[PDB]
Amino acid sequence: KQNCLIKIINIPQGTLKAEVVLAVRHLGYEFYCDYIDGQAMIRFQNSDEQRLAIQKLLNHNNNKLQIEIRGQICDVISTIPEDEEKNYWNYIKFKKN
Secondary structure (H helix, E strand, O other), rough: OOOOOOEEEOOOOOOOOHHHHHHHOOOOOEEEEOOOOOOOEEOOOOOOOHHHHHHHHHEOHHHHHHHHOOEEEEEOOOOHHHHHHHHHHHHHHOOOO
8 A cells, every 4th residue: 555654753762662562552543563763664554544643643732743652752754755665665575574
């Protein structure tokens, strides 16, 4: 599917993948997480659930996409550049056993 990715950034040093996962889990949609270091890539089932997840994230004061992980505010980027998306789908098509 296309257009179902968000990138969480500036996750505090050495957060565990599971802590990210538990945070995204509260949005209530199913997702796959790939967490490298500081940056988590969250993939949703389809464009509709991606948009619902972004709508859940949206903070109606500053109008920012935010998620709390380990008490710290981390920003969500919803416009993943095309080539980077290509790379994610690639590293997925390879890294799975």
